[PDB]
Design a protein around this nucleic acid. Sequence first.
RNA 1: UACCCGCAGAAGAAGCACCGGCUAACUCCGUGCCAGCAGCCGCGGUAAUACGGAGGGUGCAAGCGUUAAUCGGAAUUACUGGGCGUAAAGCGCACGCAGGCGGUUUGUUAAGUCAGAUGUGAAAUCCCCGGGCUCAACCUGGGAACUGCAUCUGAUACUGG
RNA 2: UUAGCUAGUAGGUGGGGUAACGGCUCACCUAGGCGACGAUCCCUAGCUGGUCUGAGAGGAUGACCAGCCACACUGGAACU
Lengths: 129, 205, 122, 80, 82, 156
Amino acid sequence: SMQDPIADMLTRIRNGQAANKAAVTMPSSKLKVAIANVLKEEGFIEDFKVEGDTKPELELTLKYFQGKAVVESIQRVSRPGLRIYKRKDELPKVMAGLGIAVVSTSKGVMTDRAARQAGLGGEIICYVA
Amino acid sequence: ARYLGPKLKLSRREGTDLFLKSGVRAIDTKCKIEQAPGQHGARKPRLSDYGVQLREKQKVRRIYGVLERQFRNYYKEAARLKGNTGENLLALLEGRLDNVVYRMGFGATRAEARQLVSHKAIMVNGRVVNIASYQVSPNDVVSIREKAKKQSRVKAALELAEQREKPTWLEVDAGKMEGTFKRKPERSDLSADINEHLIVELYSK
Amino acid sequence: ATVNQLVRKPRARKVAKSNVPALEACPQKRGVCTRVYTTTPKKPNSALRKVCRVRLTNGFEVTSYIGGEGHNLQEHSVILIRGGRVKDLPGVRYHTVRGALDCSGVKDRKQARSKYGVKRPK
Amino acid sequence: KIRTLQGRVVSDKMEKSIVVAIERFVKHPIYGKFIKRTTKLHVHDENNECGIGDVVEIRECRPLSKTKSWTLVRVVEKAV
Amino acid sequence: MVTIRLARHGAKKRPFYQVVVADSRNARNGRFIERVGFFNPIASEKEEGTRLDLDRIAHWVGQGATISDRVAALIKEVNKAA
Amino acid sequence: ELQEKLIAVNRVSKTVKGGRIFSFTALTVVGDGNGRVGFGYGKAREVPAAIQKAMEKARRNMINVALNNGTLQHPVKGVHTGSRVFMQPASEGTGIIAGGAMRAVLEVAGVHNVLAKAYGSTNPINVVRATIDGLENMNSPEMVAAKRGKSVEEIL
RNA sequence: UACCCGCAGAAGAAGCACCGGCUAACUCCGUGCCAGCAGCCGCGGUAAUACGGAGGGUGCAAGCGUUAAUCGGAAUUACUGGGCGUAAAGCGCACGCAGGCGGUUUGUUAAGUCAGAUGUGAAAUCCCCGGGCUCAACCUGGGAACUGCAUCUGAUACUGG
RNA sequence: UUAGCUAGUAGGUGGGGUAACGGCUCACCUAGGCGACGAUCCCUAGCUGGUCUGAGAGGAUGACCAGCCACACUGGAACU
Ligand SMILES: [Mg+2]
Ligand SMILES: [Mg+2]
Ligand SMILES: [Mg+2]
Ligand SMILES: [Mg+2]
Ligand SMILES: [Mg+2]
Ligand SMILES: [Mg+2]
Ligand SMILES: [Mg+2]
Ligand SMILES: [Mg+2]
Ligand SMILES: [Mg+2]
Ligand SMILES: [Mg+2]
Ligand SMILES: [Mg+2]
């Protein structure tokens, strides 16, 4: 039973990067598009696009820099069954600022750094390094 | 609370000169500082990381004139103070009244500077201090009592101290034999042969 | 394993028992000798190590070991049992600290006198 | 303005009283797990009208007999 | 009754009496309601010996509080000085 | 010029028809006070030959690490067959708080302030490879900015 | 009384533990698996730098060692921070209650979450900045902290109704 | 390797009693109340601010002091 779509997306992109794939098509979602927007903004991916009327499908394009995959480690944090909620003071920092610790809060899902800048906490979604 | 034995066995065990003698003669011409004291000083074994850390700590302690308890207290103070732990430890060790008296040159050795401090001979800001660990604040004035200003020992120490390189963080004037403490000494001002990383690691162990 | 299983069954500790049961968290215990004798240690070691079955004042009766060289212990002797085991003696879990009420210090010893209750020579 | 709680009634086989089962969400201090905890209370409601199955709203008051220190304020979602 | 008195929180030969509004039935150095300044009979010059808060002392003494013998003298001295 | 430290010498032995023959294995680590660091594992019949064989292989297998001025960039973890090392940067005056074979490799790699901890089998042969792999896989602000398309000021 | 002044003389004042590896420090003499050491590896069968004595060195210091108790190392109960093919670990298998989780879009609410404010979290204690005993220990002023709870006001990206 | 406990016990009506709310207690009525989110039973144990160890998370602990609780040879009771 598919009980976590975010984990499925992370697994798909991590396997595509390992297998040196070009595009990873998957069934999309509102949160998937919101996370893909953050990935495009942070430059960890190359492009994301939602193509579908009745069943929307996200087709992300993998980004490669001199052979090495741009994303080093993708990790789910607040998996279903263990929810993590940290305030503004205790927001995580991935790889001493070299990685993102994406946070979802009231003002959308922008990123950990933007959440700290705005002064609001939230729930951790994905660690991308 | 201080070492009451020979002052050169420690130096020859450490391997270098710890400034525990006056300086009228040469250390090599006065003792046999090339090997450890005892029957097996010539035999040189291999020392581990713990061995070299302990040797560095003992060298620092013998140079400055402190015991294990006081040295650990100074290390804790340096650790709690923000900044470089080794630099803070060196500054705290240098801030002792006997050490600044030795720098001014009122005593041949630190064991004599502290003896003068304890024998009611040092008059700091008009108040006598008998503590060899008395911390000296910036812009502090250290002087000598009347009953010790006209001694032969202080004059001999002052004229002998001209051989060494004068410290750059004191402004002692010999006309009245009184000194003023300037900005605290730094790692570059002090000797660069003292490895403070070994000191900070030995206590971290 | 899983967080739900951990919440259900807590990650419990593992209590370890002390190796000196007859002390009851006490450094020294005064007792009276009952059986003074010598025993042969386990192989490969071989000796005539002097031990003593002694009943403590609390009610426990254990066997301790006599250190040094030469002692004046026998039946109906007051000793001070101290906590410490001997590896090569099966059953011995304690010693008798010297310099106590009756177990005098070792004779003709001038090194490590703290552990054997020997006075400072003149 | 005044504090009040909401729960589910589980038993009312008594005169002018009901038994409520309030559910709360807490985080586990050790494992950080969100589990549902229950706080059952003895609530007295004069002129008995609440059955079993619906949710009720209660307010803290003085003790009445030995252990019911709560009163019913409103009846929301009475549907079975 | 409710009174404002002195509780010694110094050391051997070093008295230091904090001014506390403590009930008369409680201990000298035990329970108290609030603390109003302090007093140091050993402190020399250049040191602020007394820091009693006159506003809160008056606010308490209005509601039936009793000022102790030495506390009243210290308050009088503080008022005379400044 | 370059600094070198051999960490542990072993006494591995074989068995033959006429008895058991002896041998020696030496593990050495070489560096130059900068990001260049390497390890070598020599096998010979005596300790000097073993260490001299290990030194050459260490020098020829030296690798580069993008370390900072006095410490590392970001905390990193290295996973080998039986060793799991975790290293993190520290501040001025903390020193090299590391144990086992990690202290020597960090000292020859030039990091002066670092906190390291090893979990698992702490044998030098595996822990050296674990820490070398952990140090070689760490990133730098310039490299991550180049690979992501952003700037070092943007990703601070 | 603190404190200070003059007396005269170096006097009235240093001991304890260890020295094969862990761990900082090696050489001789005495027995001879005996005396014995021992926290683990282990030593004593004519010299074991491992026992006792001596020299020497090492460490601490008016303290030095042992014992009694807790924790770290022990990631060796692992929430941070582990495993189950073979080192200990998939129930013999299936159904299924409570319980745990839950595909996708929108609307409603705001319980969980987040931000702000108030009350409080006694004093004492830790930390930071300063002051007083010749100095430290000690005392002391302010700040921070007490990571918690309740209430009120705003958000619905996420979980839940 | 402690699965049932409770008949003043759950609640209600009426009266009496403390400074007041109160099965605090009697007289009637409805058989309920608690329990796998651990009732009942057994052993041990004063609680807390704090203390020690640990980078933290945690573990142990309650010396002095401070706040609270309980007890004055043991049990029972009442008066001012
Ligand atoms: Mg040894
Ligand atoms: Mg395991
Ligand atoms: Mg098997
Ligand atoms: Mg098996
Ligand atoms: Mg199976
Ligand atoms: Mg001061
Ligand atoms: Mg407090
Ligand atoms: Mg919803
Ligand atoms: Mg009745
Ligand atoms: Mg632990
Ligand atoms: Mg009595």
